[PDB]
Design an enzyme around this catalytic site. Sequence first.
Site, PDB file in Angstrom:
ATOM      1  N   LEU A  64      -0.080  -1.526  -0.302  1.00 55.51           N
ATOM      2  CA  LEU A  64      -0.325  -1.570  -1.826  1.00 55.51           C
ATOM      3  C   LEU A  64      -1.672  -0.610  -1.939  1.00 55.51           C
ATOM      4  O   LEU A  64      -2.464  -0.813  -1.433  1.00 55.51           O
ATOM      5  CB  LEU A  64      -0.454  -2.643  -2.498  1.00 55.51           C
ATOM      6  CG  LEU A  64       0.732  -3.377  -2.563  1.00 55.51           C
ATOM      7  CD1 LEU A  64       0.647  -4.947  -2.834  1.00 55.51           C
ATOM      8  CD2 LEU A  64       1.737  -2.920  -3.702  1.00 55.51           C
ATOM      9  N   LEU A  86       4.094  -9.396  -9.681  1.00 54.54           N
ATOM     10  CA  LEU A  86       4.490  -8.563  -8.519  1.00 54.54           C
ATOM     11  C   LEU A  86       5.964  -9.021  -8.338  1.00 54.54           C
ATOM     12  O   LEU A  86       6.402 -10.071  -7.783  1.00 54.54           O
ATOM     13  CB  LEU A  86       3.698  -9.457  -7.259  1.00 54.54           C
ATOM     14  CG  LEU A  86       2.243  -9.955  -7.288  1.00 54.54           C
ATOM     15  CD1 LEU A  86       1.625 -10.366  -5.820  1.00 54.54           C
ATOM     16  CD2 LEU A  86       1.427  -9.198  -8.088  1.00 54.54           C
TER      17      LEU A  86
HETATM   18  C1  LIG Z   1      -1.531  -5.027   1.111  1.00 57.22           C
HETATM   19  C2  LIG Z   1      -0.435  -5.424   0.746  1.00 57.22           C
HETATM   20  N1  LIG Z   1      -0.577  -6.792   0.506  1.00 57.22           N
HETATM   21  C3  LIG Z   1       0.846  -7.361   0.106  1.00 57.22           C
HETATM   22  C4  LIG Z   1       2.162  -6.656  -0.041  1.00 57.22           C
HETATM   23  C5  LIG Z   1       3.213  -7.245  -0.144  1.00 57.22           C
HETATM   24  N2  LIG Z   1       4.309  -6.772  -1.434  1.00 57.22           N
HETATM   25  C6  LIG Z   1       4.983  -5.773  -1.334  1.00 57.22           C
HETATM   26  S1  LIG Z   1       5.573  -5.274  -2.895  1.00 57.22           S
HETATM   27  C7  LIG Z   1       4.346  -6.530  -3.727  1.00 57.22           C
HETATM   28  C8  LIG Z   1       4.383  -6.534  -5.203  1.00 57.22           C
HETATM   29  C9  LIG Z   1       4.474  -5.148  -6.068  1.00 57.22           C
HETATM   30  O1  LIG Z   1       4.090  -5.399  -7.277  1.00 57.22           O
HETATM   31  P1  LIG Z   1       3.901  -4.189  -8.293  1.00 57.22           P
HETATM   32  O2  LIG Z   1       3.412  -2.923  -7.787  1.00 57.22           O
HETATM   33  O3  LIG Z   1       3.691  -4.570  -9.839  1.00 57.22           O
HETATM   34  O4  LIG Z   1       5.509  -3.832  -8.435  1.00 57.22           O
HETATM   35  P2  LIG Z   1       6.928  -4.418  -8.927  1.00 57.22           P
HETATM   36  O5  LIG Z   1       7.782  -5.184  -7.722  1.00 57.22           O
HETATM   37  O6  LIG Z   1       6.670  -5.522 -10.008  1.00 57.22           O
HETATM   38  O7  LIG Z   1       7.716  -3.177  -9.435  1.00 57.22           O
HETATM   39  C10 LIG Z   1       3.618  -6.834  -2.954  1.00 57.22           C
HETATM   40  C11 LIG Z   1       2.604  -7.982  -3.048  1.00 57.22           C
HETATM   41  C12 LIG Z   1       1.657  -5.056   0.295  1.00 57.22           C
HETATM   42  N3  LIG Z   1       2.946  -4.227   0.563  1.00 57.22           N
HETATM   43  N4  LIG Z   1       0.647  -4.691   0.718  1.00 57.22           N
HETATM   44 MG   LIG Z   2       4.757  -5.200 -11.193  1.00 58.86          MG
END
Ligand SMILES: Cc1ncc(C[n+]2csc(CCOP(=O)(O)OP(=O)(O)O)c2C)c(N)n1
Ligand SMILES: [Mg+2]
Lengths: 594, 594, 198
Positions: free
Chosen positions: A422, A477
Amino acid sequence: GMAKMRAVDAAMYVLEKEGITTAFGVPGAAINPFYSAMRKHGGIRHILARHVEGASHMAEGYTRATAGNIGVCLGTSGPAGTDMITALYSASADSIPILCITGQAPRARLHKEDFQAVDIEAIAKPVSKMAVTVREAALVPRVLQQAFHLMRSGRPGPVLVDLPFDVQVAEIEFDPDMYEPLPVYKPAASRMQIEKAVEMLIQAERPVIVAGGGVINADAAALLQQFAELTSVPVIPTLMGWGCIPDDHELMAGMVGLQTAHRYGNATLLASDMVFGIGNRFAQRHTGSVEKYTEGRKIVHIDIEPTQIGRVLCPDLGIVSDAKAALTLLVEVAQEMQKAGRLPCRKEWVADCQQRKRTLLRKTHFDNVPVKPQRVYEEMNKAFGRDVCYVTTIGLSQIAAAQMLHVFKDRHWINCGQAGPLGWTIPAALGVCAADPKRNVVAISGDFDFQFLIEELAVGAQFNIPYIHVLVNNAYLGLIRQSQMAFDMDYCVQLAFENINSSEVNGYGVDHVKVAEGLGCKAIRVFKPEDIAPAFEQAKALMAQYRVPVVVEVILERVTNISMGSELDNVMEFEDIADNAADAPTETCFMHYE
Amino acid sequence: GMAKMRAVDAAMYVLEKEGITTAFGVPGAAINPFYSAMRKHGGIRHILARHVEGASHMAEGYTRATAGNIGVCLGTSGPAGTDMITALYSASADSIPILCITGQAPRARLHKEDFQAVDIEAIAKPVSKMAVTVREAALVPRVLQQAFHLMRSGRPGPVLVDLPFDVQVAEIEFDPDMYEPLPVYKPAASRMQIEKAVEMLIQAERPVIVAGGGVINADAAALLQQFAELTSVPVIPTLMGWGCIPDDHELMAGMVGLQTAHRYGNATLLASDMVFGIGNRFAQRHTGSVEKYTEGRKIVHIDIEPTQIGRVLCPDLGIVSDAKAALTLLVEVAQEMQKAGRLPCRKEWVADCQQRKRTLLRKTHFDNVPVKPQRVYEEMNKAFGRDVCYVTTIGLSQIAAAQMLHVFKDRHWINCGQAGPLGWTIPAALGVCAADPKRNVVAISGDFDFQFLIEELAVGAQFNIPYIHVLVNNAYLGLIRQSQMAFDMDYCVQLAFENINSSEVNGYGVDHVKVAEGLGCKAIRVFKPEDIAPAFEQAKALMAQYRVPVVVEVILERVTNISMGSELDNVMEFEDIADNAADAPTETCFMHYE
Amino acid sequence: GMAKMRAVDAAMYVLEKEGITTAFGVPGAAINPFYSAMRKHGGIRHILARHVEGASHMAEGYTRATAGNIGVCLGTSGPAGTDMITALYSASADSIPILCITGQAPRARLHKEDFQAVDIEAIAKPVSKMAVTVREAALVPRVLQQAFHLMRSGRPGPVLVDLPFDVQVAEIEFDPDMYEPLPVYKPAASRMQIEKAV
Ligand SMILES: Cc1ncc(C[n+]2csc(CCOP(=O)(O)OP(=O)(O)O)c2C)c(N)n1
Ligand SMILES: [Mg+2]
Ligand SMILES: Cc1cc2nc3c(=O)[nH]c(=O)nc-3n(C[C@H](O)[C@H](O)[C@H](O)COP(=O)(O)OP(=O)(O)OC[C@H]3O[C@@H](n4cnc5c(N)ncnc54)[C@H](O)[C@@H]3O)c2cc1C
Ligand SMILES: Cc1cc2nc3c(=O)[nH]c(=O)nc-3n(C[C@H](O)[C@H](O)[C@H](O)COP(=O)(O)OP(=O)(O)OC[C@H]3O[C@@H](n4cnc5c(N)ncnc54)[C@H](O)[C@@H]3O)c2cc1C
Ligand SMILES: Cc1ncc(C[n+]2csc(CCOP(=O)(O)OP(=O)(O)O)c2C)c(N)n1
Ligand SMILES: [Mg+2]
Ligand SMILES: [Mg+2]
């Protein structure tokens, strides 16, 4: 010719000879001599990041944008190197190089407890092809010379070079006119291997080619398309091969897998009797259980790395080769087979694949308020041209984007597919823009990904690096919410709060318009589906006018379950499917792209 | 009693028995079973960070706030663990623990290339006391049991526990009533060692005690002060010992070193004939060249870690001991020496040290516009009470803060002194607030440090965690600018740009008021020195009213060279010195603190 | 009383205070200063082996014979340390200690390809509780002090101490009368656990 200079001055000549024109970084006391040499040399453009992790993902985006690029990430000693590990992991995981350079404590103080001195060599070893603290000033050019060989040879991957302060400033003699880059090592398939592969392909009655990131890594997209056209064999790109044949090509059969995949792609793979794998690696999110993926199918696998072949499943053939060398020979052999009349006609199988692609769809044309994310991707397909270059990371944002956007050239899907850190998206998009100022870069993030490294927007402002960032905001998330449904819980995944400065975000928490504007960028918020297209048009105008990143934030419904499953034959469709263009109007079967 | 449960459910009972009440983290698919067990158990309060690096520095701040705390950082597989390395390094470097817990791919897939699976065990080994992938469900409680022993024993440091998904969900039998924490190992000085140290101290004519972070680590501040009072020996805290005797105590002689040090402290150390080191380690930024630091001085060194003694210089004595055990015996022996009439009077030496402290000052009372940073620290001393708890990282912001702020209790200077990772300050301050909601937390950042992890302000907004953040903005990496003067350059260190949304920042680039407000916090910008004090008063009111972080941004002159040098006898004073209270009115000699 | 002496002389006093009376080894040029200090100090009986692996297994047998014994194995740089790995593994695997001491190239030359110089620290780390190249002369007594704590504490296991030649011969100030062995860490069951077991 020969002259006395600091070892960092020799390094600037080596970087120049190795094609380096750009670097992303954060200076500090221990790497100042290198910055001093870079200033004196000129002709490396430095971009100052606002997080060392931002500099490292910009380097990744720069590498990925254009074949032959190697993004460079610079930082000081201590925590700078530890802030680069995530990017070294991401680049290693996807088989692409970045060159990380860190300052270090002087040689004689390496085992004292010098301020901000850390054993980055040991930390970075597991996520790099080479991580070395340079112990002699005269070795600085030779370590860089070896680093470039490793970054380009075999299976590509990143290198970290750690430079003790005294080693940087020490005087050596160096002749830039005598410096030459080392040859690149790439094994090549023999004609005997390739004729056997083509024989097996001719014997199959329902073959598909799975075109992986190795085809793009080898800069072999045109050859991959030519080989499919000559053999009339449908092509399924992996997520990392996506773009190596255009999405509107008649032989492009969709993508396969548990998440970033199409219903027609999975159905075509399950109907096929051979998988001709070129530059792929049969990843777990692509195959599901290997027993089901390989059932009833002969499997060919061409890979540059011998220990990738048989790692997750046993191929029927198995060939060690660079994908360009292999495809050059595959085109030649297929042409000899065509002149001999030995290539079977495949009109029926190609017709069956095309009928699946016309009927096994997912709805995107939603009028809902609050907005449904699948509608955002429909509007992106309409608003941006055929030459759009998407940059994204992970989330429901990215998964549905891969299900519903379309791409038409290699290196126009820029995605850290194996590591998915992320915060990758903004810095990676800036690095693509730095590699190619004429690239039409459009990023896709969810709110959480956008927040990790949100401060990097000010890098685009300070340096006038324009691109459009689509931000789909569910105050969640969302992917983790969806994966928690198996635990019958919704827990520690919500980002909403009543923003004391912005009652207009309606409890969604962070006000991304105000944040992006404070960071020097432009931003537009969209609540209604019909306002998306005009917002993309204003964003293009604001970009041309101000030459900064422009954020288009779409407020989503809080909860949308994106299609996914645990096997190719078990992907659940939570949201509406479609079998008609009106519900899914931007499929390439129905829409002409640019 | 005994019951079947998931190994993660057993882990929740172990964490409870080990005193854990709080965790900072970011969930993901691979760590969901742990989050599910944490929800079912209750009584761990989870704080959701907006960067995994933010969660890890919150854990560090939580550990550092209060003796016996162990901050917990939770994350998923893959890039989450690599985002924790910088915090593991920072905690290791300062001898403090955090417990990092990561999800992992299932045991049988560890050497496939599973999505987001990385060898975090190997990466984290160099920056932890233990980093282990747990290979059996029944070992989960035992690995945690050992982790708590290591985090508290010997020289403290962090642990990383990596949990394969199948190991988390597997059923074991576990009896929480039978679980007991392991004993903590701490060696203790013998009476023979301590009597020898007190004999050497009695023989010295101008001794100083150097009180290091080990005194605070051992929770021995009151004993350290009592021993100095009984022997009438002036005390020089290290940066990491700062606060273990109050800054207005008559025996507090100032700090020593190349940067975070006082002119009186360095002058007193150079005038002394013995350094009685307790829980310090003679760091390079504290000593300069060891030959000059030790010249003409007997050196005593008490350290819990045998291989810290003699690492950078050879002590005359050298004692392995926990600092609390040692100081208990030092007080007892000094009391026996006092009854015997054997402690020399030290009125002359104490008077000489106090005269240096009264005269060797640096000016803070600047009326300049744009503001001079040293004036900000004067106003902070006046505005905040004696119980203020400062949180800071690195930069000219932090160096001048340590030169000019004053602290009056242990664990009221919270500073990552050895690693100094940028972005530490906001998450560390949030972690201190989570450890102690009644703590009067005031953070100090420069603009660059503030930007790295700026999104963490939204954590304070979402969870209503209030504190005051002083932000001193020079649109520069000011410390790096100053260190570049030796290279006759000013290069890649400027952050200024004409903000297209805010002509009122006057080319300083990022608009921190607008950013902080978009993240849900309150913010005030100050241009004139006389407006600082009222701004600190409004910030206190806004904090009470909205219960969110309040940012006070002071616009600085672009360029201020802070005092520093390469030896204790070579610190250059660029800005005005002072020898009178009017120029430096918040020295404790002149001002009563609260 | 305190006195100037070589680090290897201080090492001899530490070994004496820790109860060492016997060593098994094969000398070489890189460990000669240690042998010189052992000769001057007296009262460690040295047995010359006819293979370095022989000396290392003699050390194992010496440890195993009698509670509290710690066999000591001495060797030179390079192949001598690689010849001790099988014993370090065998000692680790049975939870018993031996103390291996190797000579090493001078600190300044550890990354030059000096004759018979190997990264024994890295090779031995998987099969020891500690394997360390001592970087300062003043640390030699402290590394040995910690080694004896590790060899006796918790689950016992072996230690390898690797001594650069310049570190061995450098002078330090050391007071044998002030040296004290560290406390041994051994967790104990509580009465609640023993009553449940009974
Ligand atoms: C550093 C890190 N921590 C945790 C994750 C696990 N992870 C994958 S998707 C996600 C949530 C994504 O949220 P957002 O960017 O708001 O997207 P949405 O799924 O809500 O469209 C998380 C925490 C990751 N990929 N990288
Ligand atoms: Mg989101
Ligand atoms: C949330 C999420 C969901 C995803 N869902 C899916 C999904 O449903 N389906 C899917 O397929 N992917 C999916 N992905 C991506 C997936 O994790 C992998 O990154 C991807 O499948 C790997 O593609 P590939 O097999 O082409 O491998 P690559 O990582 O691109 O590597 C393939 C091979 O190329 C080789 N190679 C390198 N250079 C050369 C060269 N010059 N010549 C030849 N070979 C070379 C390497 O040795 C390697 O073995 C998803 C990712 C995320 C984050
Ligand atoms: C920009 C900048 C400038 C700085 N300038 C200076 C400066 O001028 N002067 C200065 O002094 N510092 C300065 N610092 C801080 C410096 O880098 C060190 O962090 C600091 O000096 C270390 O203090 P210490 O010796 O107390 O060591 P610590 O890191 O606090 O550790 C000391 C010892 O405590 C031991 N220990 C742990 N637990 C116990 C226990 N229970 N009992 C006994 N011992 C124990 C450990 O084994 C360790 O050896 C600066 C930092 C920065 C970022
Ligand atoms: C991750 C990381 N990269 C680089 C550094 C080196 N560094 C130390 S201070 C500094 C600049 C600090 O700037 P700012 O926070 O604005 O403070 P100022 O010195 O201007 O007061 C940098 C880059 C670091 N400590 N951490
Ligand atoms: Mg950030
Ligand atoms: Mg600044």
